[PDB]
Amino acid sequence: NNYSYIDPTQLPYDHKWEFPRNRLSFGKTLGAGAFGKVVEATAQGLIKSDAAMTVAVKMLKPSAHSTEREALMSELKVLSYLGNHENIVNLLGACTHGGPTLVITEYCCYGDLLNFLRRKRDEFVPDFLTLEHLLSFSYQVAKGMAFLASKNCIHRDLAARNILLTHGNITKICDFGLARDIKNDSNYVDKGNARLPVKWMAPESIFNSVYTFESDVWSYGIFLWELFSLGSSPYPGMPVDSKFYKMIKEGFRMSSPEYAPAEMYDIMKTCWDADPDKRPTFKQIVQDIEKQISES
Ligand SMILES: Cn1cc(-c2cc3c(N4CCN(c5ncc([C@@](C)(N)c6ccc(F)cc6)cn5)CC4)ncnn3c2)cn1
């Protein structure tokens, strides 16, 4: 074993990220859960010494178990190893002393795509949301995940609620709390006992707790359905129950959403192949959508 995969979570925290927490002023809460929250904040002198900048800050509550603190640090280390990409919510800094650990990321001023699509739903036509916008969002998300996959990382919670929108109609993948580097094993088996995004999950993830590059692609197919339905909930009217799992196992798939081009529903159908090996890669999806964009 003289050659090994470098586990990014085993690498030392790089203090190049460190930022004084008293230069942050917290604002509105952007998301919250049992373990912690993400808040809007002003960062004084973060990039330029004399300028204030709006950021998002991720934090655990003081009651958070030791397991949660290490997990937030592991997320920080994954983001540090991944590096910058246009289509992810990038790491900007961290506060690792003087209080609870804070992870400072880019702030996306339009919020999550799911809520955005639901707002623009009434005024959509194929500042009006158009089909060109939807194709762009599909392309940008595929580019972001191709980047993640090229770094041997899986996200494991891809969904329109975890895609954010910023200036210039740029979409960024967010929430890397469950992202894993799967270099060594080519998959990840989840040993946890958390609430899971069942309607976005590949059947092998539901039934065998197996997560792979191919299960991220399944979720991307679901995301496309959210996108071209302008934010409808997946499997409308179907609760998550015995019948849901049975139908998924037997091959039931959502039909084409109202505004999806035939070539985009073709992508979703392949993303939802019961055989993971028959699903496209994100690199293939990027190329496919690139062709569709250039044909207007
Ligand atoms: C109305 N509006 C909204 C935005 C907006 C929203 C974000 C954003 N997000 C916020 C949501 N997210 C998020 N919420 C909760 C968790 C937790 C609960 N699971 C969690 C928290 C801390 C922790 F230690 C462990 C888990 C995780 N993540 C992140 C993405 N990031 C950037 N800009 N931005 C801009 C803009 N207008």
Residue numbers in the entry: 566 to 691, 762 to 931
Text taken from the publication that reported this structure:
Avapritinib is the only potent and selective inhibitor approved for the treatment of D842V-mutant gastrointestinal stromal tumors (GIST), the most common primary mutation of the platelet-derived growth factor receptor α (PDGFRA). Against this background, we solve the crystal structures of avapritinib in complex with wild-type and mutant PDGFRA and stem cell factor receptor (KIT), which provide evidence and understanding of inhibitor binding and lead to the identification of a sub-pocket (Gα-pocket). Furthermore, we report the identification of a sub-pocket (Gα-pocket) located in the N-lobe of the kinase domain, which is surrounded by amino acids of key regulatory elements such as the Gly-rich loop and the αC-helix.
Intense screening and optimization resulted in two complex structures with avapritinib in wt and gatekeeper-mutant KIT-T670I. As anticipated, a water-mediated interaction of Thr670 of KIT-wt and the N4 of the pyrrolotriazine scaffold is clearly visible in this structure. In contrast to the published working hypothesis, the water molecule thus forms a polar contact with Thr670 instead of a water network involving the catalytic lysine and the gatekeeper mutation, which results in a loss of an important interaction. Finally, comparing the binding modes of avapritinib in PDGFRA and KIT, it is striking that the interaction of the catalytic lysine (Lys627 in PDGFRA, Lys623 in KIT) with the pyrimidine was not observed in KIT. Additional water-mediated interactions were identified in KIT linking the ligand’s primary amine and Lys623 and Asp810. Apart from this, the mode of binding is very similar, and almost all interactions described for PDGFRA are also evident in KIT. Interestingly, we observed that the Gα-pocket addressed by avapritinib appears to manifest only upon ligand binding. Thus, our detailed analysis showed that the binding of avapritinib to a DFG-in, but αC-helix-out conformation characterizes it as a type 1.5 inhibitor rather than a canonical type 1 inhibitor.
